[PDB]
Amino acid sequence: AAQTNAPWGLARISSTSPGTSTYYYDESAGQGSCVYVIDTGIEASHPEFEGRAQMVKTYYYSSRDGNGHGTHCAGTVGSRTYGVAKKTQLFGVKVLDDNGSGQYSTIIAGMDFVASDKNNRNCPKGVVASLSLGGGYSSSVNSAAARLQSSGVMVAVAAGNNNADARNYSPASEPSVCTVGASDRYDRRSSFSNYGSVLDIFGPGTDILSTWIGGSTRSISGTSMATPHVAGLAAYLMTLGKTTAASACRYIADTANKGDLSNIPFGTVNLLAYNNYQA
């Protein structure tokens, strides 16, 4: 399949060079896989989700996304127009309030929740969790991410937006999960992207067009936007049978475009997520 005039980040993950505008992908498109978006929620009624999204848990008064961030990230995972894995099933867990903030105890509870809830869901091709959130180092938050990964869920987390070593942030600094940095459309490390030896992979994160609340769309930037490209790519590769939840991060690294990025500090991987699709 080929989506013409695609958002640049989708084109980039299906090309060995920057500057293209077509997203090439296998028509299976992640069908049979499930991705939990643990964030401010998802506007499940947005036409772009085609009924494939639902809220399964909230830690606040409402399960609605009153912010937009979670709907944007969900759109990059699995919306029709803006998504990597266009037939995946999306489940929303609202651990952040409508200002985008949340306590670490709530975020940990949401991770433990997904580890259990996935046992109640029909996801024959596997389960992914996308965490576009973080804050300062916490061993308890790292441990919760490690548990979620160990339970059989491919965990992708944002590296953070401090232009700093991600070793000082959580859950970015948990080695067992897949920690994602951001790049821009010219193949530079995004100016805000964290870096460091704990990063596993880069994905597109500057000026990413996706779904927004009120049935709308907008372009925003962050390692929060790069993470769902990698989460959607994992769901897509698991559906194709190329890899499993345990090894997807390593498979994505091994099959990445290598050495293409600029402004990568010594000690940080120079690897950009790539779907290796050949028609």
Which residues are annotated as catalytic? 39, 69, 224
Return the number of the residue (44 or 177) whose C-beta is nearest Ca ion: 177
Is residue 177 part of an annotated ligand binding site? Answer: yes
Q: How many residues bind Ca ion (CB under 5 A)?
A: 2
Under the criterion CB under 5 A, does residue 200 sit at the interface with Ca ion? yes
User: Tokens for 160?
Assistant: 């953070």
Minimum CB separation of residue 250 from Ca ion in Å reads: 9
Q: Please name the residue ranges forming H helices in the chain.
A: 8-13, 69-78, 104-117, 139-150, 223-239, 248-254
Minimum CB separation of residue 249 from Ca ion in Å reads: 6
Q: Which residues pair with 183 in a beta bridge?
A: 189, 204
Is residue 16 part of an annotated ligand binding site? Answer: yes
Return the number of the residue (80 or 167) whose C-beta is nearest Ca ion: 167
**Residue 108: φ, ψ to 5°:** -60, -45
Q: With 0-12 CB in 10 A as exposed, 13-18 as middle and 19+ as buried, what is 5?
A: exposed
Q: Please name the residue ranges forming H helices in 151-270.
A: 223-239, 248-254
Under the criterion CB under 5 A, does residue 65 sit at the interface with Ca ion? no
Return the number of the residue (136 or 175) whose C-beta is nearest Ca ion: 175
CA angle at 89 for the pair 83 and 94, rounded to the nearest 5°? 90
Pairing of strands 271-272, 257-258: antiparallel
Minimum CB separation of residue 26 from Ca ion in Å reads: 26
Answer yes or no: are the C-beta atoms of 199 and 272 closer than 8 Å: no
Return the number of the residue (74 or 155) whose C-beta is nearest Ca ion: 155
Minimum CB separation of residue 148 from Ca ion in Å reads: 13
CA 77 centroid distance within chain: 6
Closest C-alpha to 151, from 134, 125, 176: 176
Helix (H), strand (E), coil (C) string for 25-43: CCCCCCCCEEEEEEECCCC
Under the criterion CB under 5 A, does residue 154 sit at the interface with Ca ion? no
Return the number of the residue (48 or 200) whose C-beta is nearest Ca ion: 200
Is residue 141 part of an annotated ligand binding site? Answer: no
Q: Could you say which residues in the range 158-197 bind Ca ion, by CB under 5 A?
A: 175
* Distance of alpha carbon 226 from alpha carbon 182, whole angstroms: 5
Minimum CB separation of residue 157 from Ca ion in Å reads: 9
Give the CB-nearest residue to Ca ion.
Answer: 200
Annotated binding-site ranges: 16, 175, 177, 200, 260
Which residues bind to Ca ion, rule: CB under 5 A?
A: 175, 200
Annotated binding-site ranges for Ca(2+): 16, 175, 177, 200, 260
